[PDB]
Design an enzyme around this catalytic site. Structure first.
Site, mmCIF file in Angstrom:
data_model
loop_
_atom_site.group_PDB
_atom_site.id
_atom_site.type_symbol
_atom_site.label_atom_id
_atom_site.label_comp_id
_atom_site.label_asym_id
_atom_site.label_seq_id
_atom_site.Cartn_x
_atom_site.Cartn_y
_atom_site.Cartn_z
ATOM 1 N N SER A 1 118.209 -53.468 -7.447
ATOM 2 C CA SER A 1 119.356 -52.747 -8.026
ATOM 3 C C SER A 1 120.319 -53.786 -8.598
ATOM 4 O O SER A 1 119.889 -54.623 -9.406
ATOM 5 C CB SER A 1 119.948 -51.813 -6.981
ATOM 6 O OG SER A 1 119.041 -50.785 -6.655
ATOM 7 N N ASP B 1 114.727 -44.985 -13.840
ATOM 8 C CA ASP B 1 115.510 -45.427 -12.694
ATOM 9 C C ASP B 1 116.645 -44.450 -12.406
ATOM 10 O O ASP B 1 117.327 -43.976 -13.319
ATOM 11 C CB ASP B 1 116.064 -46.829 -12.951
ATOM 12 C CG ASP B 1 116.848 -47.371 -11.776
ATOM 13 O OD1 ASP B 1 116.223 -47.872 -10.818
ATOM 14 O OD2 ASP B 1 118.093 -47.289 -11.810
ATOM 15 N N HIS C 1 114.205 -45.444 -7.132
ATOM 16 C CA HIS C 1 115.223 -46.489 -7.097
ATOM 17 C C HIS C 1 114.799 -47.539 -6.082
ATOM 18 O O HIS C 1 114.557 -47.201 -4.920
ATOM 19 C CB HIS C 1 116.589 -45.904 -6.733
ATOM 20 C CG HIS C 1 117.733 -46.841 -6.973
ATOM 21 N ND1 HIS C 1 117.962 -47.438 -8.194
ATOM 22 C CD2 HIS C 1 118.719 -47.274 -6.152
ATOM 23 C CE1 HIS C 1 119.038 -48.200 -8.115
ATOM 24 N NE2 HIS C 1 119.516 -48.119 -6.885
HETATM 25 O O1 LIG Z 1 123.163 -51.379 -7.424
HETATM 26 C C1 LIG Z 1 122.827 -50.221 -7.788
HETATM 27 O O2 LIG Z 1 122.257 -49.440 -6.974
HETATM 28 C C2 LIG Z 1 123.104 -49.762 -9.216
HETATM 29 S S1 LIG Z 1 123.680 -51.167 -10.214
HETATM 30 C C3 LIG Z 1 123.750 -50.619 -11.945
HETATM 31 N N1 LIG Z 1 123.509 -49.349 -12.224
HETATM 32 C C4 LIG Z 1 123.546 -48.899 -13.470
HETATM 33 C C5 LIG Z 1 123.833 -49.744 -14.533
HETATM 34 C C6 LIG Z 1 124.089 -51.104 -14.259
HETATM 35 C C7 LIG Z 1 124.384 -52.002 -15.302
HETATM 36 C C8 LIG Z 1 124.632 -53.336 -15.013
HETATM 37 C C9 LIG Z 1 124.590 -53.787 -13.696
HETATM 38 C C10 LIG Z 1 124.297 -52.903 -12.665
HETATM 39 C C11 LIG Z 1 124.047 -51.550 -12.956
#
Ligand SMILES: O=C(O)CSc1nccc2ccccc12
Ligand SMILES: *[C@@H]1O[C@H](CO)[C@@H](O)[C@H](O)[C@H]1NC(C)=O
Length: 347
Positions: free
Chosen positions: A146, A247, A292
């Site tokens: 993530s 995702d 995820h």
């Molecule tokens: O950590 C998690 O579960 C989600 S992180 C995350 N989601 C969506 C877009 C992102 C873009 C740039 C950096 C991180 C993003």
């Protein structure tokens, strides 16, 4: 099977609230392979939403309540049956407590309510690990899921340069980015979306990005380097990219929740767009699933793309870097266009 907690001896490297950062370690003597996993868990880009995150996600902003041990699962597991890939490697789990996608280098002071030092946490962890066996390492695999996967893309080259200028050119630094390959695409329906959250986060965290990517996009535009298809081509270290085609976090920031035609075309175009960005990524594993994370899930060995599992794909990737392989593919990207068209997707 347990990884033991070690808070950073350099207490100037802190979590969000000033508590010291740290890492979980399970050593494996007789092994020169070192796996440093970067935890995910979204982010926060202003005082208000970081305060909300501190009320309900404090373990992602503070070490005061961390447990003393943690069980290695998936690629961090030490049993061959759960981790065919690197069961014998030295395991490191670095908790995500900076809320900065592992990019910040800003201490908390009279002007900053929170410290965002994610980039410094990785380096200080690497530095304190040399005295515990990493100095004799042969491979340092920087992995993450993530926001931790995006943190691999932001920090894998910085890890290599730090070891180079410290007298360790024998340790081959590599990256494993899991579910951190996001698209700055248009939302299905129109707080800041995703591309505006990173823009404000960088200024709020004083985040840093890979140097060559920084030099391409320059001042004010470093947010571009948080997106895999723009920052990956500028990296020198080998990076294996694991990415669900659909995702859940990607759909969340896209405001996607009987599917009508408009949403169907949006979902199929998203899967198409992600495949295209991976066409030039030689080492990749991208199943057509709505999920995820994977690499630290206990049943990460179950998913297959074109008959090859992720542990095997990672094994073939190790072989390809041993100075073109028969029946050992490294580029595994599903082509079918809808969530769960791969029968081995999680349920
Ligand atoms: O950590 C998690 O579960 C989600 S992180 C995350 N989601 C969506 C877009 C992102 C873009 C740039 C950096 C991180 C993003
Ligand atoms: C502790 O970390 C800070 C920030 O990375 C650095 O400036 C300082 O030199 C470090 N101290 C030691 C003793 O390594």
């Amino acid at each position: 099977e347990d990884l033991r907690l070690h808070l950073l001896l350099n207490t100037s490297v802190t979590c969000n609230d000033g508590s010291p950062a740290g890492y979980y370690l399970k050593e494996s003597r007789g092994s020169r392979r070192w796996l440093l996993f970067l935890e995910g868990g979204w982010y926060c880009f202003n005082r208000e939403n970081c305060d909300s995150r501190y009320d309900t996600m404090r373990r992602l902003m503070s070490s005061r309540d961390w447990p003393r041990t943690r069980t290695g699962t998936g690629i961090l597991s030490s049993q061959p049956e759960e981790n065919p890939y690197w069961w014998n490697a030295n395991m490191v789990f670095i908790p995500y407590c900076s809320s900065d996608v592992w990019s910040g280098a800003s201490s908390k002071s009279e002007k900053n309510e929170y410290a965002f030092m994610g980039a410094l946490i990785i380096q200080e962890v690497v530095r304190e690990l040399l005295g515990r066996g990493l100095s004799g390492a042969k491979v340092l695999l920087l992995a993450g899921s993530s926001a931790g996967g995006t943190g691999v893309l932001l920090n894998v080259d910085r890890v290599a340069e730090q070891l180079e200028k410290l007298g360790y050119p024998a340790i081959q630094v590599r990256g494993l980015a899991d579910s951190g390959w996001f698209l700055d695409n248009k939302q299905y329906r129109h707080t800041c979306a995703p591309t505006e959250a990173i823009r404000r986060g960088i200024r709020y965290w004083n985040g840093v990005v890979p140097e060559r990517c920084r030099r391409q996009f320059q001042e004010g535009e470093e947010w571009n380097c948080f997106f895999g298809y723009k920052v990956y081509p500028t990296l020198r270290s080998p990076v294996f990219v694991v990415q669900w085609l659909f995702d859940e976090a990607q759909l969340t920031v896209d405001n996607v929740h009987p599917v009508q035609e408009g949403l169907r075309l949006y979902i199929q175009n998203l899967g198409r767009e992600l495949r295209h960005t991976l066409k030039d990524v030689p080492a990749s594993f991208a199943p057509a699933c709505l999920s995820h994370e994977i690499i630290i899930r206990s049943h990460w060995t179950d998913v297959q793309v074109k008959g090859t599992s992720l542990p095997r794909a990672l094994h073939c990737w190790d072989r390809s870097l041993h100075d073109p392989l028969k029946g050992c593919p490294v580029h595994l990207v599903d082509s079918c266009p809808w969530p769960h068209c791969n029968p081995s997707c999680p349920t």
